[PDB]
Amino acid sequence: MNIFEMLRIDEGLRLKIYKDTEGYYTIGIGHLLTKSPSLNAAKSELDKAIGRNCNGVITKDEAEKLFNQDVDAAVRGILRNAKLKPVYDSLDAVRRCAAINMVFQMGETGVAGFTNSLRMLQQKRWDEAAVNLAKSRWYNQTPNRAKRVITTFRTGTWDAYK
Ligand SMILES: Cc1cccc(I)c1
Ligand SMILES: [Cl-]
């Protein structure tokens, strides 16, 4: 297992514009297009991202290239963030994947409310961090996804994905 396989499981793959769990226009492997309610705005964002007139549909190769860019952007966001980088650098490789997964889903600033969890993770207090992570809108709105990610933080294994 690696971060790409983990996120492909969590996000799936769709080649036409769809709505995510919050109602936002998305394509590919969880690539957010826009938070605007306008499908025309979403189609414009798609064409800009792919570099051709897509009319709302992409190829598998295009979806995979967008996905590589999005994972790269999540990692770079962690590494540039003064609050996230020291925690990330303290983690083993499996738990680092759980961190990238959260940033991919919620953004560098969407994890801003997890200050107490970050401290517990840096101290390697895994059970306490797991309980704190579950006291969140994230867990209550996407519980199966959150349980898999939390279990990965708690155990440092891939057991939730196997
Ligand atoms: C809990 C969490 C989420 C995103 C990134 C890190 I480092 C830790
Ligand atoms: Cl879920």
Report the structure determination method.
X-ray
The structure was resolved to a resolution in Å of 1.4
Q: Which residues contact 44 (CB under 8 A, 6 or more apart)?
A: none
Ligand 2 center–CA 140 separation, angstroms? 9
- For ligand 1, whether the C-beta of 132 sits within 6 Å is no
Place of tokens 């705005």: 41
Three-state DSSP at 158 gives coil
Q: What DSSP string runs through 94-139? A: HHHHHHHHHHHHH-TTTTGGGHHHHHHHHTT-HHHHHHHHHSSHHH
Active-site residue, 20 included? yes
Instruction: Enumerate domains of the chain plus CATH numbers.
Output: 3-161 (1.10.530.40)
Rounded (10°) CA dihedral 113, 117, 121, 126: -150
Q: What DSSP string runs through 53-93? A: --TTB--HHHHHHHHHHHHHHHHHHHHH-TTTHHHHHHS-H
- How far is Cα 46 from Cα 52, in angstroms, rounded to an integer? 9
Ligand 1 atom showing the smallest separation from residue 96 Cα: 7
The residue annotated as part of the active site, out of 10, 11, 62, 70, is 11
> Is 68 among the annotated ligand-binding positions?
no
- Buried b / exposed e across 53-63, counting CB within 10 Å, b at 16+? ebebebeeebb
